[PDB]
Amino acid sequence: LKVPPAINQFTQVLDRQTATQLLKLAHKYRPETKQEKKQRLLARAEKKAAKRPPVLRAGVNTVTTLVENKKAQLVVIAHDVDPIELVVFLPALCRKMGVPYCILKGKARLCRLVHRKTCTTVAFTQVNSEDKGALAKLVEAIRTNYNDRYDEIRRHWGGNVLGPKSVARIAKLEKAKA
Amino acid sequence: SRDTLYEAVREVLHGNQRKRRKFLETVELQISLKNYDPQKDKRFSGTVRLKSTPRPKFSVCVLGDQQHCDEAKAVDIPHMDIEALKKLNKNKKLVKKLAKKYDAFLASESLIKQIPRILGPGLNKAGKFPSLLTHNENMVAKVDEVKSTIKFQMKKVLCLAVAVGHVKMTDDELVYNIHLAVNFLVSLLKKNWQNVRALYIKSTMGKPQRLY
Amino acid sequence: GAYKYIQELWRKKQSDVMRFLLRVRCWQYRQLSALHRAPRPTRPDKARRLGYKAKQGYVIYRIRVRRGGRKRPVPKGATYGKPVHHGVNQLKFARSLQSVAEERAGRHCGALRVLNSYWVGEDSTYKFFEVILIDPFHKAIRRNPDTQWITKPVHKHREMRGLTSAGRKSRGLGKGHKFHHTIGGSRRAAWRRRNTLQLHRYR
Amino acid sequence: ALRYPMAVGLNKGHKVTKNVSKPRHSRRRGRLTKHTKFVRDMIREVCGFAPYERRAMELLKVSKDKRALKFIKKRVGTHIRAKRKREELSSVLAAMRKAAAK
Amino acid sequence: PIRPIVRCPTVRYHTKVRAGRGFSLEELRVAGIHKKVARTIGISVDPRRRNKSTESLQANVQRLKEYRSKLVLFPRKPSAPKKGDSSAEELKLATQLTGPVMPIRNVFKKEKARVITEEEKNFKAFASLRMARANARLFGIRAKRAKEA
RNA sequence: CAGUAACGGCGAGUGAACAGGGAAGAGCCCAGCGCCGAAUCCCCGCCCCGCGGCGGGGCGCGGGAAAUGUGGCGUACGGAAG
RNA sequence: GGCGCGCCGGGCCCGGGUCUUCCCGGAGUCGGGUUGCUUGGGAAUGCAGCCCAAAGCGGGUGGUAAACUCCAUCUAAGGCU
RNA sequence: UAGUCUGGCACGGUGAAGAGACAUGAGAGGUGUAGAAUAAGUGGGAGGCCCGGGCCGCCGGUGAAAUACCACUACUCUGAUC
């Protein structure tokens, strides 16, 4: 089928070399596990009975609301959202609002950043002073790749590739007149 | 009849980065059309009323038995007698000399007729029609009709173009050099169906700026 | 908030994006059975509106219902009546195909309660509706004090007595000058009142 | 003269000093705010136009305006909607012409 | 609870007064009662009622000032009183009320016999009716012909 | 109201509603928009009271649901923050 | 069975008036064309099939089809009682 | 009136060979007496240009606008297409 560029743009996915560098940076700014939360509440009583860190903003609603607000430094999107209407627009939003964005393979991989099964979108709202440089060299090679090719992406129809034996019948007919 | 309307009656503004001028100029408007028949009974005329200081430039004149010999020889009234204008119409076909030395007249008060024989009427089919407003408010009473309503002539280009402003009259006062002009472009608008295509609000020195 | 985007994106149905999506989904839906289960809503945003939460005990069934009108099931197309009732072909069913999809979802899943239904695509011979059903005996629903209205026996088989939204649309009730034939409870209550002779004991 | 308040004519009915308030918050529904204007203009850019909008648009590039109304009307339904639809489509087309030169 | 004063609609009836459904929020507002406290101290509340007139309003504001003066209020814990409550004198003299609270009766003004003015006798009330009828009928095209003129 | 306005080979026939007086009287909640570290929910295993409507408490790096959005605030009578 | 003083267990630690500053909404649904039934509802009261299908200073209603124009009145397509 | 025959709309797509388009970037393009000159022209214009002089001019000379002096839209061939 003749697939439209808004849907098809999710098949231009981030490269293996960059995606490894990206998940190495993303792995330091995890949300806390549900069991990690309680040992933080163990560390309450030493002033009470006797300043919050950067994480990945998870979910689509709570990444969409901080793309429109100019509060996302890089937005990571999964390529394989089951109904695609959930995520179709975030390319357009991030480009228009001037947010650098990349598309990764595996919502299961991006959901293993958080401590759930799947997570469609994952944003970098802030990072720490010593990990500024890694985010800086990511946004360089990602913003040149996606956000600046956007007039190119918007006019690019995917699909429309016939079966290999229908192609091989055409090629036989083509060399039959030569 | 009406093809266009305005609500964002703005966007003249980006002017100083265009115009870096010193000397004598006068900014003019280019405003292109479509669908006019130059062969038919289809007319397009009028004189569109800007009382906010636009500048035509011409061979001057000023008429009238006023207090003219006191007031109107500040910019020099060269008052030739209305009986010494009999030459202008009788030296037309037997003589071959352009006997004007004139391109702009008056319409005076204190006299309530101009000259009701064939010398005042006489200006009906020469162009440069004596029309102007100086009468008995006496605000400027001379330069009102240079600072006047802006004139156009419909010809074999089926286009409208007309002066807007002077190298003077700042950009908050030259936004007001179309304000009582584009409303008369929908008022006295005849059966010249779907006319306007380009509204280029022009600062002469710079870029073609468009306001559609 | 993404749900505002998905709402408006689902309104542009004759776009490039949606005219593709609706076509490949209407393909997919033909290649399953007429009455089967979905593991999540096709349209998460639309179910949000019509009263779905994403907790345990909320079920989504996907029912296909055959398009077209209703022909009078009389043998050899011959009604034994006066020429008024010679109608066979061009008759129409007084309930909608959305309400028919609700009552098949409900009848099959007898132990669940039909909340609402929404259109997820149509065909030439089929319409597809995703119906929200709730398990009334699940403690997630049973211990939540704002969704334990459905755990009373009055809301048994709402789809069949016509209390659902697509059901209600068939009865022709509402306030004002247009709904004067269902004053009181319903169409029958109005008929009963206006035809009941009130013989007072004194007269 | 004296003029009695009468029950028939132009200024009829019982004269009363009427207090004028703010309308209720129900009356302001269906008013375009900046945040929801944003969303419609984004999903215009994502999607595009319907095959009847494009057909009525390429009628208005050729300037068959009456036939553009008649087409939008027979597609959408009634006059007032087709009037508002053409007034919007022509403004989209005039913004394209603002992008044509620059 | 107490029902407000309301005019019957439709010219046949608008010379009468009923009991309304409930007190408008802009009558509670200018009377100084909260819309969620009003219902708990026995005042009917309608959120649908508009106020076109200021006399329809002002009658119903003076209705609530009389009601809030008449009202005896018991302590929420009967042994320890609060500020907005009544005195133990009134609490022991407090009684069940029979019938509709501060009932709505329909009183008309008293016009003393006056001497008829020389103009008052002169006024042509029938001709005024007839020429008010024609001014209402023909006005529309009188404006049209005057526009075309 | 009223066998009325209206329907009807305008034939036979059919046929409501508003206003008015009472009987009764009672009001509300989501989604959405947004902020609160999912602050939310279900279930197993051990202990104690103690429940012929299976509920409260302690305990667990026990298991799951859930960012494809649970709970709190909040809904057209306006709402929220300072 | 029902209720009140109070002993006693648990939780909840919560108000209003005025300005400044943000925000505001249910779509193959309204709507239109046609067809069948229905209605007291008559150039079509309600319901349904099929085709076309929106808007946001919008939309609905204003018992005669339609255009232009003021005015009134509600906030549909989610839910409980 | 069932059925059958026939037309329209919907599911319903993709591609090459063969016209008018217009979105759209161009290049050719014009002959009234009459003037020394194939006037596509308006709001301009005594002036602006390139090595201080020139430059095209001015006047009249044809006519209700006239040749140098920012830029535009149009009409008749031509002409590339995401």
UniProtKB/Swiss-Prot annotation, chain A:
Cite the record's note on assembly: Component of the large ribosomal subunit. Interacts with CRY1. Interacts with DICER1, AGO2, TARBP2, MOV10 and EIF6; they form a large RNA-induced silencing complex (RISC).
Under the GO molecular function aspect, what terms does this record hold?
RNA binding
- Which positions carry N6-acetyllysine? 24, 137
For the cross-link Glycyl lysine isopeptide (Lys-Gly) (interchain with G-Cter in SUMO2), list the residue numbers: 24, 165
Instruction: Write out the annotated subcellular location.
Output: Cytoplasm
Q: What GO terms fall under cellular component here?
A: cytoplasm; ribonucleoprotein complex; ribosome
Keyword Acetylation on entry: yes
What name does the UniProt record give this protein? Large ribosomal subunit protein eL8
**Predominant subcellular localization, coarse grouping:** cytoplasm
Q: Which family does it belong to?
A: Belongs to the eukaryotic ribosomal protein eL8 family.
Q: What does this protein do?
A: Component of the large ribosomal subunit. The ribosome is a large ribonucleoprotein complex responsible for the synthesis of proteins in the cell.
Query: What keywords are assigned to this protein?
Result: Acetylation, Cytoplasm, Isopeptide bond, Ribonucleoprotein, Ribosomal protein, Ubl conjugation
Curated annotation (Swiss-Prot), chain B:
- Which UniProt keywords are present, listed alphabetically? Acetylation, Cytoplasm, Isopeptide bond, Phosphoprotein, Ribonucleoprotein, Ribosomal protein, Ubl conjugation
CDD domains, alphabetized: Ribosomal_L1
Checking PROSITE patterns in the record gives: RIBOSOMAL_L1
Q: Which SUPFAM superfamilies does the entry mention? A: Ribosomal protein L1
Q: Where is this cross-link: Glycyl lysine isopeptide (Lys-Gly) (interchain with G-Cter in SUMO2)?
A: 113, 156
Q: Where is this cross-link: Glycyl lysine isopeptide (Lys-Gly) (interchain with G-Cter in SUMO1)?
A: 113
Highest taxon of source: Eukaryota
Got a GO cellular component term for this one?
Answer: large ribosomal subunit
In terms of InterPro entries, this protein maps to: eL8/uL1-like (IPR050257), Ribosomal_uL1 (IPR002143), Ribosomal_uL1-like (IPR023674), Ribosomal_uL1/biogenesis (IPR028364), Ribosomal_uL1_3-a/b-sand (IPR016095), Ribosomal_uL1_CS (IPR023673)
GO biological process terms held by the UniProt record: translation
Localization (cell)? Cytoplasm
Phosphotyrosine-modified residues are where? 6
Major site of localization recorded for this protein:
cytoplasm
Q: Which Pfam families match?
A: Ribosomal_L1
UniProt keyword Transmembrane helix, yes or no: no
Under the GO molecular function aspect, what terms does this record hold? RNA binding; structural constituent of ribosome
Modified residues annotated as N6-acetyllysine in this record: 86, 101, 113
Per the entry, what this protein does is:
Component of the large ribosomal subunit. The ribosome is a large ribonucleoprotein complex responsible for the synthesis of proteins in the cell.
The record's comment on protein family reads: Belongs to the universal ribosomal protein uL1 family.
This protein's assembly is summarised as: Component of the large ribosomal subunit.
Q: What is this protein called?
A: Large ribosomal subunit protein uL1
Q: Which gene encodes it?
A: RPL10A
Curated annotation (Swiss-Prot), chain C:
Locate the compositionally biased regions of type Basic residues.
Answer: 168-181
**InterPro entries in the record:** Rbsml_eL15_core_dom_sf (IPR024794), Ribosomal_eL15 (IPR000439), Ribosomal_eL15_CS (IPR020925), Ribosomal_uL23/eL15/eS24_sf (IPR012678)
GO annotations of cellular component type: cytosolic large ribosomal subunit
One example GO MF annotation: structural constituent of ribosome
- Which residues form the Glycyl lysine isopeptide (Lys-Gly) (interchain with G-Cter in SUMO2) crosslink? 82
In this UniProt entry, the residues modified to Phosphoserine are 33, 96, 99
What biological-process terms (Gene Ontology) are attached? cytoplasmic translation
Which PROSITE patterns does the record associate with it? RIBOSOMAL_L15E
Q: What is its main location?
A: cytoplasm
The family database entries (SMART domains) matched by this protein are listed as:
Ribosomal_L15e
Q: For the region Disordered, what residue ranges are annotated? A: 164-185
Write out the N-myristoyl glycine lipidation residues: 1
Subcellular location(s) per record: Cytoplasm
- Protein keywords: Cytoplasm, Isopeptide bond, Lipoprotein, Myristate, Phosphoprotein, Ribonucleoprotein, Ribosomal protein, Ubl conjugation
- Give the family from UniProt: Belongs to the eukaryotic ribosomal protein eL15 family.
Q: How does it assemble?
A: Component of the large ribosomal subunit. Interacts with IFIT1 (via TPR repeats 1-4).
Q: What does the record give as the function of this protein?
A: Component of the large ribosomal subunit. The ribosome is a large ribonucleoprotein complex responsible for the synthesis of proteins in the cell.
Q: Kindly provide the name given to this protein in its UniProt entry.
A: Large ribosomal subunit protein eL15
Q: Give me the gene this protein comes from.
A: RPL15
UniProtKB/Swiss-Prot annotation, chain D:
Keyword field contains Ribosomal protein: yes
**Gene Ontology cellular component annotations, sorted alphabetically:** cytosol; ribonucleoprotein complex; ribosome
Q: Which domain of life is it from?
A: Eukaryota
Subcellular location, in the record's words?
A: Cytoplasm, Cytosol; Cytoplasm
* Residue ranges of the region described as Disordered: 8-30
Keyword annotations from UniProtKB, A to Z: Acetylation, Cytoplasm, Ribonucleoprotein, Ribosomal protein
Positions carrying N6-acetyllysine: 61
| Any one GO molecular function term | structural constituent of ribosome
- InterPro entries with a match to the protein in the record: Ribosomal_eL36, Ribosomal_eL36_sf
User: Where is this protein chiefly located?
Assistant: cytoplasm
Q: Does the keyword Translocase apply?
A: no
Q: Where is the composition biased (Basic residues)?
A: 12-30
Q: What biological process terms from GO does the record include? A: translation
Q: Record's family?
A: Belongs to the eukaryotic ribosomal protein eL36 family.
Assembly and partners are described as: Component of the large ribosomal subunit.
Which function does this protein serve?
Component of the large ribosomal subunit. The ribosome is a large ribonucleoprotein complex responsible for the synthesis of proteins in the cell.
Q: Tell me what this protein is called.
A: Large ribosomal subunit protein eL36
Instruction: Specify the taxonomic lineage.
Output: Eukaryota, Metazoa, Chordata, Craniata, Vertebrata
- Per the record, the gene is RPL36
